[PDB]
Amino acid sequence: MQDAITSVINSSDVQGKYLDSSAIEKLKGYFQTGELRVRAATTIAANAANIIKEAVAKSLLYSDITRPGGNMYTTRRYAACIRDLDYYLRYATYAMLAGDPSILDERVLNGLKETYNSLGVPIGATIQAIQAMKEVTSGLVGPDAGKEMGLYFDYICSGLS
Amino acid sequence: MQDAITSVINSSDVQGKYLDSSAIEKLKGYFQTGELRVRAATTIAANAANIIKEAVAKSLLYSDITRPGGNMYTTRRYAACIRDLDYYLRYATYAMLAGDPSILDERVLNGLKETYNSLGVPIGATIQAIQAMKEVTSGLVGPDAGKEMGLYFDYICSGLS
Amino acid sequence: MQDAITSVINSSDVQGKYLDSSAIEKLKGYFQTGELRVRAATTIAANAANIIKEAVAKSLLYSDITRPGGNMYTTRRYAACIRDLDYYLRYATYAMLAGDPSILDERVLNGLKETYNSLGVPIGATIQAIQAMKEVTSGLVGPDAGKEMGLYFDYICSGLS
Amino acid sequence: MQDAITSVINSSDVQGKYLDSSAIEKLKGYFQTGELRVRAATTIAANAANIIKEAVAKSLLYSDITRPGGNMYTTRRYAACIRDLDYYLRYATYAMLAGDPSILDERVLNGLKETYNSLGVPIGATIQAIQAMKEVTSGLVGPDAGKEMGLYFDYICSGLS
Amino acid sequence: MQDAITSVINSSDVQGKYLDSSAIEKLKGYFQTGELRVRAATTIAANAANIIKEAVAKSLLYSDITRPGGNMYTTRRYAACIRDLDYYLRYATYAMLAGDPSILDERVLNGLKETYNSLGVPIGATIQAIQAMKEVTSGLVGPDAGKEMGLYFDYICSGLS
Amino acid sequence: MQDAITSVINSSDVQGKYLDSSAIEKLKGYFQTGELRVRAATTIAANAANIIKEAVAKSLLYSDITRPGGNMYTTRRYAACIRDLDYYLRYATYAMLAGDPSILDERVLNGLKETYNSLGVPIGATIQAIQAMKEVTSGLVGPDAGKEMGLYFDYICSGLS
Amino acid sequence: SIVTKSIVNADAEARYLSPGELDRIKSFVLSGARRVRIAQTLTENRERIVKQAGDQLFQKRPDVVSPGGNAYGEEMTATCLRDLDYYLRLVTYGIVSGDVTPIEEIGLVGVREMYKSLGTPISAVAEGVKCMKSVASSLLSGEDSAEAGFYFDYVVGAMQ
Amino acid sequence: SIVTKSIVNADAEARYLSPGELDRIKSFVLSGARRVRIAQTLTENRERIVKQAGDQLFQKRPDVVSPGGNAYGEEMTATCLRDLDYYLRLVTYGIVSGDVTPIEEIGLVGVREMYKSLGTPISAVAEGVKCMKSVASSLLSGEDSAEAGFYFDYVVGAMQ
Amino acid sequence: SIVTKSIVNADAEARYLSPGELDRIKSFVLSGARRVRIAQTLTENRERIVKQAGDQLFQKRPDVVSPGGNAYGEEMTATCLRDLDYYLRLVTYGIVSGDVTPIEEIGLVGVREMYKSLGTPISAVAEGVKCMKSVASSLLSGEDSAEAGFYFDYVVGAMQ
Amino acid sequence: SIVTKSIVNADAEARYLSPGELDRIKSFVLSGARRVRIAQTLTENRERIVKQAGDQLFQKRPDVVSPGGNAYGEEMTATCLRDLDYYLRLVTYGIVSGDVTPIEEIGLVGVREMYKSLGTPISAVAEGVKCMKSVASSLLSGEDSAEAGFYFDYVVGAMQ
Amino acid sequence: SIVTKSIVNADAEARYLSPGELDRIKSFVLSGARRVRIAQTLTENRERIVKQAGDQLFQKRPDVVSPGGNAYGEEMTATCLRDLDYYLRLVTYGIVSGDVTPIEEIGLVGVREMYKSLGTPISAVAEGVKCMKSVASSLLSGEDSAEAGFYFDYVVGAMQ
Amino acid sequence: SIVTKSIVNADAEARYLSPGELDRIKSFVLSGARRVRIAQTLTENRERIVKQAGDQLFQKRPDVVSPGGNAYGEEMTATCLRDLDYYLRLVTYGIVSGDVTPIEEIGLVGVREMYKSLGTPISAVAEGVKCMKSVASSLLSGEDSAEAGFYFDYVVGAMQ
Ligand SMILES: *[C@@H](C)[C@H]1/C(=C/c2[nH]c(/C=C3N=C(/C=C4\NC(=O)C(CC)=C4C)C(C)=C\3CCC(=O)O)c(CCC(=O)O)c2C)NC(=O)C1C
Ligand SMILES: *[C@@H](C)[C@H]1/C(=C/c2[nH]c(/C=C3N=C(/C=C4\NC(=O)C(CC)=C4C)C(C)=C\3CCC(=O)O)c(CCC(=O)O)c2C)NC(=O)C1C
């Protein structure tokens, strides 16, 4: 569970090396994009309940999945599904604030495809819902913060497929 | 973990259907056999310590299994075995009071054959002991309550074999 | 988890046999080596911190394993390694005081090779460190207590290889 | 913690007496008012959120207690106060369904006046709020169920004063 | 919580004094009565269920205390009372094996008179029951072990009165 | 548990008042002494083990309290006493970093004089040890940081006397 | 059902059923026909209990019918009355079961998370169910009506 | 009683009573008269149910009547039938309560500790209560007899 | 404040403050003047931020202004704008503290229980605070405005 | 054995053995011959200690010999004396071990469940073992007899 | 880093970051250049900060230089100054991270177990780091020096 | 003592003492005289065991005698040998008790906190006690010497 700063520090330490110019380069590059990350981060927290309402509307609603015998039918399963959507968005914001995808390999995608094939959850409709969540966010944080954010939404999709 | 009544309700609900005549039929059929189930249920609770003493006597006692080096030798293992017999009888009565075998697939047979082949417990002498427990019960609850009860003793045997 | 005395008692009990001359023989043979075991046992407790300092010095130190990127680099990993050495020595003394290797199959070697191949711990450098711990101990408890002690250090090595 | 039925049973038992005609009298008298109690009980559960909104409106709101420096100022204290009102109403319904005030001496009034003088809670404005809760309930359960219910609201007031 | 041996050791230690002849005297005096204590100790363990049956018979049974409305009426209270008797006998044997009454001031009499006046337990009938337990024990351990044992039964009585 | 900043905020809030010039005054006055507090705070953390060694030397050592039968005799009691000294120093630094003595009324002096008269701890030798700890600190943080720090050492003394 | 509930509680305490528990299953299977008739009446008057209650909703909470309003017209107002048919159906289920558990699982656990997502006010769904209640207590006499009503009032009360 | 039991369980979950719980108190207060009549019959035939069951005890477990025997004659055999009257009385209590709790508290918690103290065999007390059962199921018809019997069989079964 | 928060966390781990914690109190006391100016601007434009945001509320959520409506006229609509002044005041408090804790304690713990009691919709109070935000981000430049806004958005988000 | 017991307790506290624990294993291995002789005497007088104690059982508890009686004749009374040989054997095991643990595991954990199943009274098995005790304390002198007896009295006492 | 630390704490409470937490990451990335310069100065004067501090060590703790002494000459004294370069390197790491966590993990967890194994006195390693501190606070001005020093004093203090 | 220890363990399991526990108190009271003689020898040779071991300390750890050195001369070196008399006294206590508990309570719980406060190296106190051991194992024969030594080696080993 490392962000860009400790990633560089450990890579130094397995070599018993002090921080060289190359390491200082990578370091200053994070510190430069740093204010960018705090702002986009706020904009998502502020629009969280909302990104999710719009993403669900666009992909999941009025379909077979919400009608009886579908995995989102019953209130318990509708609420457990937008809970998952909350988890995806909160953790993609974390990994962007961090500069690094290891919180997502660690605390999110760690054997999720297995859990989803067990409970019988549709992965394709989830990747559908995440790609929409990808579109609504980028069209709210702006372009600089959006190339970056998208990477982490995309990292989730590739670990589910 | 469902009895006959919720079995019908869920089958309705995955179809988004109100209870139709067919469902009302199955429902009235349980409510009719209902007083039958409460009475047979009492008769077993009342004769529990006793069904087990007779079933053990008939199948397990004075054999190799009770002599040194047998799985029922030592007091700890004799007491852990009639404990299992208590579990089989109590749960077969439950499933009859319920009208449905899912409490037995759920909380009794869920990977028991694996546990028994691990600890080294003889399954054949257990099915022997359950079949005797099947005979003593039916010859105490009477014929109407006994065709039914037997189903659940039989459901245990087929999940052990 | 048995010592020499209960080993004989159980072997009697699966046969429903009282202790015969053969069993009395094996029994008196432990009770005879008994004072030998308590003394060697004390000598190790007394020299514990020390056997380990010398064994580490001889095998593990000033090598690749202690330099950056080695499994004994960092203080956390150096301290977790002499902790393991403490476990090996304390448990080999236990099994000698007991007369029997079952505490070691039970509470030490039970799937350790699997844990070591997982965390990435070098088994060869550990067997190296145990063989040195074997030499320092025998050259401190004396010859009678040392043929015996060595058996238990050797039992550890064969369960790691 | 006794209702009318066990109250009679214990009074019999400290005398080693079977249930006599006098005890049967008191017993039939509860069983007679029994359907009365279940109905009034439902009517309160059904109108719970509502009795409380009206009782607060009538006594507590737009006063010194809700303005800064008052014990009901802050959301935490407003919510902790209607929580108490919920406790008073739920427990008075319990004691009526029971026929007996001992659940209230036991789990409600047990040293409450002490807790209220400690945290600095106004007892007079609470008795004010309970007396209003007394009026709204009686004017919803009807007269037969209301003479009875009032007893338990009154039992609370006398234990606070 | 001290026996005769640590009592002497601490008295030495608050003075920063090595064990002098006087301390060696008191010490050898315990070690001398030592085999006496282990034997009487066994004789009570062996006759425990029995001392209590006889002591109850002599003092507590067929009285007002066992009839309805008495503190020993109900099975729960009869069983909780011979439990207390078990506690008194087990702890008096402990204090004799120890040579010292501090386990009794510590883990038995520590505010018991207060608990007994609270639950409404008759102390006089308990001292009656302990004095009988005193007679039955002394007439089973013999005279040497009995002068000593009696001290600890008496220590209980004086802490209840 | 409030520092200077929330002290002002609450005093505003019980009056339902926005922060007025007087409140802004008190606020800017903390923010001004703020860098002063972080520096003195570091200097104590850095010299903690040391302030205590010197304070003990000056007041407690080679006295009756360290000799047998004294409350600081035994290693357990010597270590439990410099633990208390650590608590006094750490909490006085906290209250200075905070600007306010309420962490000390709350988590330190809350019924300590009672605990000390119970365990039999000498309060006079403790106030002696704190006054020395007061001298060593002020002669290390310098005069500006020392008038302030002393207030909190003094607040401890007055709550023990 | 209360059969499931009595088995689960005895199993938890690793016993056979009590006297008071075997009497409770007997009282229930002999009330079973009263249940199956109350349910039947409600399933038959389905269209009526829903349309008449929805018509009544829009007259006590009018705010939800168009200016802003979650029920915003031809596809939306239809969906609001759909949701009313979903809770009517869970209520008949509950009555024949003697148990609120099929209403809880299917429609009450997570009902606040789901409606705050869609932007639906839940006081307004509670009010809807309070209106279907009335339209049912009309079609039902004396004791059948006191019983169906225990189950409508539970659903309403888990919604605010 | 089952009123106490339903209040205690709702209080624990900090709620008002369920539908299924208000139906259970209704079924119980309307069975209350059936209860009070079964109890009355048993209280009236008190002397008979005890003496006839004790006479029957000494013929199935004869070992307890004199050679060794805990019931050892004129003061002892009297006390054995006393204890039978103590459990008859706790059984009538239970029937009007719809609950085994007054039998448990007064005579079943600690019953093994107490009888192993006095040296009484508990299989023999269970057998006694099984004999009072028979003498009661004779004096009682069809459904009254199935009900009194639920409560005699619980007491017997908590004794071995 | 973040001073309180750093002391509480070190005390819990029974230590002195870390490097990263002493740097965090330094960054905070040196930002203290920026804070006290943002707060001052908001306290001065008090009447404006509240009236203009309330005027804006009634134009995005019009449902709450009279037909049914919790804000029902001269005593009620006044109380709705009162509550807006209560959260403006808790927001200035938060900004000078570098901490959401005085907003949480005074107005967010129990805010749902209280508004469901009074019958007030909380989406509508969240929307009110979102409108005072705008009226403040106008009166505030570049970085002062990004900062006041962190605290308005937290309050809004704890309300739905 | 007490070796196993001292290793298990040190391992639990993750240490080497104490002084008092190494002295306890020394006292035990040097008593080992005293043990092996007491056991030998009891194994040799096996037939005697069992038959003479069984003969004595039927004279203190006569109730168990035929009228009703669990020991009911030629196959049963034989099995009652079998069970006496099972506990004599577990007692010799215990003496050479300095430990009640092989008696507990093989014959005392679950001894009440097993005998209430078979219908055997356990006071009567305790009394049997109390009778084999006497027949052994005759064949054994001064201190050997005090020691064998510690182990007979533990077995008896775990049986009531 | 304090980014990792703020994410871990929000994740634990299953939320988005607070105002006070987003301000703490901003204060940190804008101090990032001050950090990278302090580190650079220390990495450049590496040989100096270590040799001059080691020379100073042997003059305050002379006991460790030869009579007995763990640093016993040409291979040993070299290794003592090695260990000083290991902690100088962990200190630059810490400063750019705003966090003591890379110093803790790599060199402070288990530092007492390791040095008591090798026989090294840890008061003497703490004293070494206190000497490299001085040699660094000379090469560093006003506020850079107060900051590097927070991190040297933490390392020293975790060593006694 | 091991009497205290056997009572505490039986009390914890709410029982009477085991066979193996009554044998352990017997083995101990009959060793009591061997104990009281070992202690007596050590108390008599008090001055010798301390001065000769201190003289030996300053020749294996010479670093602690003056350059820097915690034992710094006429008041200090005296106090170092004082502390040696404190642990000799706790060792005689332990031997007559058959228990390390009076050594633990009085001088081993908190021994590291206290010596790191005073600046005393604890390896050096362990080495001191290892030197008093030798001077005692000379004055003691065969088995008395193996026994006193179990208690010196425990004290030494709890000090590093
Ligand atoms: C003067 C600073 C002190 C001193 C030190 C000293 N160290 C050593 C030996 C080792 N020190 C280490 C330390 C670490 N390894 C790590 O993983 C880390 C974290 C980054 C540290 C700090 C190690 C591993 C060794 C062992 C050598 C190896 O590569 O395997 C010695 C030599 C001990 C010997 O006799 O062999 C010494 C001298 N000496 C002192 O007395 C002081 C004051
Ligand atoms: C427009 C903002 C919304 C609105 C609000 C509204 N509020 C009230 C009544 C009250 N609001 C409070 C709130 C608080 N008390 C506190 O302690 C705190 C924390 C600082 C807050 C925010 C209180 C206490 C009341 C009750 C009045 C009193 O002094 O006792 C009403 C009136 C309700 C009534 O009918 O009596 C209203 C209108 N109305 C809306 O619909 C919106 C969108």
Q: Say if CB H156 and CB B50 are below 8 A apart.
A: no
Distance from CA of F42 to the nearest CA of K (A): 7
Q: How far apart are CA J151 and CA E40, in angstroms?
A: 16
What's the structural domain count of chain I? 1
Residue for token digits 């048995």? Answer: C2
Give this entry's resolution in angstroms: 2.2
Residue K56 Cβ < 6 Å to ligand 1: no
Alpha carbon distance K35, K30 (integer Å): 10
Please tell me if residue K78 touches chain F, with a CB cutoff of 8 Å.
Answer: no
Q: How far is CA E102 from CA E4, E41, E111, H131, I42, in A?
A: 10, 18, 14, 53, 71
Interface residue H67 vs chain J (CB under 8 A): yes
Q: Are G134 and G27 in contact (CB under 8 A)?
A: no
I11 Cβ contact list (under 8 Å, min separation 6):
F94, F103, F107
Alpha-carbon span F152 to F103, nearest angstrom: 10
B contact test, residue of H133, H137, H150, H159 with most B CBs within 10 A: H150
By the 8 A CB rule, do B53 and B85 touch?
no
- Asked if L147 reaches chain J (Cβ–Cβ under 8 Å), the answer is yes
Q: What is the DSSP string of L57-88?
A: HTTTS-TTSSSS-SS-STTHHHHHHHHHHHHH
The contacts of residue B54 (CB under 8 Å, 6+ apart) are: B132, B136
Q: Which residue has the tokens 């380990």?
A: C52
DSSP string, chain E: ---HHHHHHHHHHTTT----HHHHHHHHHHHHHHHHHHHHHHHHHHTHHHHHHHHHHHHTTTSGGGSTTSTT-SHHHHHHHHHHHHHHHHHHHHHHHHTSTHHHHHHTSTTHHHHHHHHT--HHHHHHHHHHHHHHHHHHH-HHHHHHHHHHHHHHHHHH-
CA nearest to C70 within chain A: A14
List C-alpha distances in Å: H5 to B42, B71, D97, F82. Answer: 21, 43, 12, 56
**In this structure, are residues G42 and G136 in contact, taking their beta carbons and an 8 Å threshold?**
yes
Number of helical (H) and strand (E) elements in chain F, helices listed first: 8, 0
| Six-digit token string for J91 | 């007692």
| Chain length of chain B | 161
Contacts of E75 in chain H (CB under 8 A): 106-111, 113-114
Residue E36 half-sphere exposure toward CB, CA atoms < 13 A: 17
Task: Return the ligand 2 atom nearest residue D57 CA.
Answer: 36
**Would you say B73 and B79 are in contact if contact means Cβ atoms under 8 Å apart?**
no
Nearest to C84 by CA among J21, K117, L157, J5: K117
| CB-CB contact of F159 with F113 (8 Å) | yes
3-state secondary structure of C81: helix
Burial class (CB in 10 A: 0-12, 13-18, 19+), D63: exposed
Going by C-beta distance under 8 Å and a sequence separation of 6 or more, which residues neighbour residue E47? E140
Touching status, chains I and D (3+ beta-carbon pairs under 8 Å): yes
- Cβ–Cβ below 8 Å for I24 and K27: yes
CB H107 within 8 A of CB H87: yes
* Cα K75 versus chain centre, distance: 24
Cβ pair F116, F123 in contact under 8 A? yes
CA distances from H96 to A102, D30, H48, K148 (A): 66, 12, 21, 82
Token pair for L73: 């001369």
- Please measure the distance between the N-terminal and C-terminal CA atoms of chain D and give it in whole angstroms: 23
Nearest CA in chain C to A15: C68
A45 contact I CB<8A = yes
- Residue B99: both structure tokens together: 């009208």
The Cα B67–Cα B63 span in angstroms is 7
Tokens of L16: 């009477």
Distance CA D159, CA E15 (A): 59
Q: Give G43-92 as a 3 state SS string.
A: HHCHHHHHHHHHHHHCCCCCCCCCCCCCCCCCCHHHHHHHHHHHHHHHHH
What residue type is K129 in one-letter code?
A: V
**Cβ(H54)–Cβ(H84) below 8 Å:** yes
Q: Are A85 and A129 in contact (CB under 8 A)?
A: yes
Nearest to B35 by CA among H36, G3, H21, G95: G3
Cα–Cα separations (whole angstroms), residue L16 to E46, J110, K16, K121, L155? 9, 20, 59, 50, 32
Q: Tell which residue, K123, K115, K54, F49, has the closest CA to residue L70.
A: K123
Tell me which residue has its CA closest to atom 27 in ligand 1: C62
- The minimal CB distance from I68 to the residues G61, G119, G160 is found for G61
Cα dist. E94→D60, E107, E152, L9, L31 in Å? 63, 11, 9, 11, 21
Do residues F4 and F99 lie in contact, with contact meaning Cβ atoms separated by under 8 Å? yes
- How far is the C-alpha of D103 from the C-alpha of D1, rounded, in Å? 5
The number of angstroms, rounded, from the C-alpha of A14 to the middle of its chain's C-alpha atoms is 29
Q: Considering only CB atoms, which chain L residues are within 8 Å of F75?
A: 106-111, 113-114
C75 CB within 6 A, ligand 1: yes
The structure tokens listed for H13 are 């979950």
- Residue ranges making up the domain that contains J129: 1-160
Name residue J2's amino acid. Answer: I
Our CA angle for I37, I42, I43, nearest 5°, is: 95
| Contact (CB<8Å) J3/C45 | no
Tokens representing residue F109 in the block: 């002096």
Query: What's the CATH code of the domain at J59?
Result: 1.10.490.20
Residue D56 Cα to ligand 2 midpoint, Å, equals 13
Residues E2, E30: contact at Cβ < 8 Å? Answer: no
DSSP characters over I124-149:
HHHHHHHHHHHHHHHSS-HHHHHHHH
> Method used for this model?
X-ray
Ramachandran region, residue E35 (left: φ > 0; alpha: ψ -120 to 50; beta: rest) = alpha
Question: In angstroms, what CA-CA distances link F11 with I38, I84, I93?
Answer: 20, 20, 11
CB D91 within 8 A of CB H17: no
Half-sphere exposure of J85 (CA within 13 A, CB side): 18
DSSP H18: P
Q: Are C89 and C73 in contact (CB under 8 A)?
A: no
Residue appearing with tokens 């006597």: B57
* Ligand 2 atom at minimal distance to the Cα of residue I84: 2
Identify the CA nearest to B118 among candidates B66, B71, B50, B64: B71
Q: What secondary structure does DSSP assign to C120-154, as a single string?
A: T--HHHHHHHHHHHHHHHHHHH-HHHHHHHHHHHH
Alpha carbons D34 and D30: distance in angstroms, whole number = 6
Closest alpha carbon within chain G to D48: G157
- Would the CB atoms of G156 and D46 count as touching at under 8 Å? yes
Quote the CA–CA distance of E148 and E132 in Å, as a whole number. 16
Kind and range of the H or E run holding D119: helix D112-119
Distance of CA D76 to the CA centre of its chain: 23
Tell if the CB–CB gap between E16 and L11 is shorter than 8 Å.
no
Q: Ligand 1: distance of its center to the CA of E93 in Å?
A: 58
Using the Cβ of G12 and the Cβ atoms of chain B, whether some distance falls under 8 Å is answered with no
| Residue G96 Ramachandran class (φ > 0 left, ψ -120 to 50 alpha, else beta) | alpha
Ligand 2 atom nearest to CA at I119: 33
Amino acid at E6: T
Q: What stretch of H or E contains G26?
A: helix G19-29
Q: Do the beta carbons of residue I33 and residue F30 sit within 8 Å?
A: no
With beta carbons less than 8 A apart as the criterion, state whether H12 and H122 touch: no
Q: Do H and J count as touching (3 or more CB pairs closer than 8 A)?
A: yes
Ligand nearest to the CA of I121: 2
| CA dihedral sign, ordered J11, J13, J14, J16 | negative
Residue L64 tokens, joined: 């602690």
Give the count of beta carbons closer than 10 Å to the beta carbon of residue H143.
Answer: 11
* Phi, psi of I81, deg, nearest 5: -80, -25
Rounded to the nearest 5 degrees, what angle is found at the Cα of D32, between the Cα atoms of D28 and D37? 130
Q: Is G70 within 8 Å of G114 (Cβ atoms)? A: no
In order of their start, the domains of chain F are 1-161 (1.10.490.20)
Distance CA C2, CA J1 (A): 9
CB-based touch A/G (3+ pairs, under 8 A)? yes
The answer for residues whose C-beta is within 8 angstroms of residue E127's C-beta and 6 or more apart is E157, E160, E161
Q: Is the CB of D61 under 6 A from ligand 2?
A: yes
Task: Give the chain D residue nearest I105 (alpha carbons).
Answer: D76
